[PDB]
Amino acid sequence: ALCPAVCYVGGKALCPDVCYV
Q: Quick check: 4 and 19 in contact, CB under 8 A? A: no
Q: Is 20 exposed, middle or buried (0-12, 13-18, 19+ CB in 10 A)?
A: exposed
Q: What is the DSSP string of 1-21?
A: --S-GGGTTTSS--S-HHHH-
For residues 9 and 18, give the distance between their C-alpha atoms in angstroms, rounded to a whole number.
16
Q: Quick check: 14 and 6 in contact, CB under 8 A? A: yes
Q: Quick check: 14 and 7 in contact, CB under 8 A? A: yes
For residues 6 and 9, give the distance between their C-alpha atoms in angstroms, rounded to a whole number.
5
Q: Quick check: 16 and 1 in contact, CB under 8 A? A: no
